Design a protein around this ligand. Structure first.
Ligand SMILES: Nc1ncnc2c1ncn2[C@@H]1O[C@H](COP(=O)(O)OP(=O)(O)CP(=O)(O)O)[C@@H](O)[C@H]1O
Ligand SMILES: [Mg+2]
Length: 359
C-alpha cells in the first residue's frame, strides 16, 4: 500500500530539499558538490590542479590530480565508487540522482578505471591501461526533467572557483567553457593576502602592511588575513573547509572577541584612548576592515536555516587564542599601521557621538 521514499529516490521526488532549488542555484549545486569533493583533495595535500569544463552538450567535467576515488571493494561488497555515487551520507551521490548520466574516470592503484552510471544505475566498473598517475575525472549531465534551466552561468562558476583558489595557495583551478574556447585560470600564491588585496582595490587601504597569520590545533586549523580601508563598514569573509559561511559563526566570533580586546589593550598602553574613556566597541574597530578567516575543521557542524553557520564551540576558543597571540605580535610589530587603524577606531567612535549630539 504505502510507498516509502529512501535514498536517491527521495532526492528525485524533492530535489529542492537537497539542492536548494530546481532553478539556477540548484543546478549550479551539482557543480559545487563535485568541485568541493575535488578541492578536498587539494586541501589535504594531494591535488595541485582542478579543471572544470563546461562541455558543449551541456555536461560538466571536473578533473583533479588527487588520490583518485577509492575503487577497491567496500565493506558492502560493491566497489567503493558505487557506494559514494549511489548512497546518501548530501554529497556527490545527489549529482548522480539528478543527472541523466554520470561518468567517472579514475586513476588509482596502477591502472585507469572507468565507471558509467546511466540514470543513477552503475553499468559496471572497467579496468584499463596501467598508470602510475593518480586522480579522478567526473562527468555529469543534469536532468532536464528536474531543472527549470540546464544552462550553466560562466560567471557564477568563475566567482566561486576564484575564491576556492584564494583559500588554497597551492591550488590551480582552470575553468574553460566549450560552448557558444573561453578560459580562465586561478592561482594565487599569496593566498588569503591576494584575497584581501582583491577586496581592498576600489576601497582605499589605510595602511600598507597586510596582516597574515596561521594557527594549528587538534581537529582544526585557521588562517587569517586583514587590512583596513577608508570604508565606514566591514568586509569580513569567513570560510570553513572552503565553504563560505555567510551566516558566520564560532570562527568569526572568536576572531571578533580577540580583535576587540587586542585593539583596546594596545590603545591603553599607547595612551591612544583615555583610560577614563570607555573601551572602543567591536563596530568601531571593524569600521572599514577587510578580512578573511579560513578555518579547516576535521568534523564541522553547521547551524542556521541557511546551513552557512559554523557552530563548533571548540573553534571559537581556538581562533580567539590564535588571534590574541598573533594580532598582538602584528600590532607591536607595525607601530605605524597600529597607530592608523586605532585612530580609525577612535574616528569611528567620534562619528557616532557627532551624529548623536548634532542632532
Ligand atoms: N576526487 C576525489 N578524490 C578523492 N576522494 C574523493 C573524490 N571524490 C570523492 N571522494 C571520496 O568520496 C567522498 C565524497 O562523498 P560525499 O560528497 O558524500 O562526501 P564529502 O566528504 O564530499 C562531504 P559532503 O557530503 O558534505 O559533500 C569523499 O569524502 C572521498 O572520501
Ligand atoms: Mg561531497
Amino acid at each position: 500500500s504505502i510507498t516509502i521514499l529512501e535514498g536517491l529516490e527521495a532526492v528525485r521526488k524533492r530535489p529542492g530539499m537537497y539542492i536548494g532549488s530546481t532553478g539556477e542555484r540548484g543546478l549550479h549545486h551539482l557543480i559545487w558538490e563535485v568541485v568541493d569533493n575535488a578541492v578536498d583533495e587539494a586541501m589535504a595535500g594531494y591535488a595541485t590542479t582542478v579543471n572544470v569544463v563546461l562541455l558543449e552538450d551541456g555536461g560538466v567535467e571536473v578533473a583533479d590530480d588527487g588520490r583518485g576515488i577509492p575503487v577497491a571493494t567496500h565493506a558492502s561488497g560493491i566497489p567503493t565508487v558505487d557506494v559514494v555515487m549511489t548512497q546518501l551520507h548530501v554529497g556527490v551521490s545527489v549529482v548522480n540522482a539528478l543527472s541523466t548520466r554520470l561518468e567517472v574516470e579514475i586513476k588509482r592503484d596502477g591502472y585507469e578505471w572507468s565507471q558509467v552510471y546511466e540514470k543513477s544505475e552503475p553499468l559496471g566498473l572497467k579496468q584499463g591501461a596501467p598508470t602510475k598517475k593518480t586522480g579522478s575525472t567526473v562527468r555529469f549531465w543534469a536532468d532536464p526533467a528536474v531543472f527549470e534551466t540546464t544552462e550553466y552561468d560562466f560567471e557564477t562558476v568563475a566567482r566561486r572557483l576564484q575564491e576556492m583558489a584564494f583559500l588554497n595557495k597551492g591550488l590551480t583551478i582552470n575553468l574553460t567553457d566549450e560552448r557558444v574556447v573561453k578560459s580562465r585560470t586561478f592561482h594565487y600564491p599569496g593566498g588569503l593576502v591576494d584575497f584581501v588585496k582583491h577586496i581592498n582595490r576600489t576601497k582605499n587601504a589605510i595602511h600598507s602592511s597586510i596582516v597574515d597569520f596561521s594557527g594549528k590545533g587538534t581537529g582544526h586549523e585557521v588562517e587569517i588575513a586583514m587590512q583596513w580601508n577608508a570604508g565606514y563598514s566591514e568586509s569580513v569573509h569567513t570560510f570553513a573547509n572552503t565553504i563560505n559561511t555567510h551566516e558566520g559563526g564560532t570562527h568569526e566570533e572568536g576572531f571578533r572577541s580577540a580583535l576587540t580586546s587586542v585593539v583596546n589593550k594596545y590603545a591603553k598602553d599607547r595612551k591612544l584612548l583615555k583610560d577614563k574613556d570607555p573601551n572602543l566597541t567591536g563596530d568601531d574597530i571593524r569600521e572599514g576592515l577587510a578580512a578573511v578567516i579560513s578555518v579547516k575543521v576535521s568534523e564541522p557542524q553547521f547551524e542556521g536555516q541557511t546551513k552557512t553557520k559554523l557552530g563548533n564551540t571548540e573553534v571559537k576558543s581556538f581562533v580567539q587564542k590564535v588571534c590574541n597571540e598573533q594580532l598582538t605580535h602584528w600590532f607591536e610589530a607595525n607601530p605605524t599601521d597600529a597607530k592608523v587603524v586605532v585612530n580609525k577606531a577612535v574616528s569611528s567612535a567620534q562619528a557616532r557621538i557627532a551624529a548623536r549630539k548634532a542632532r
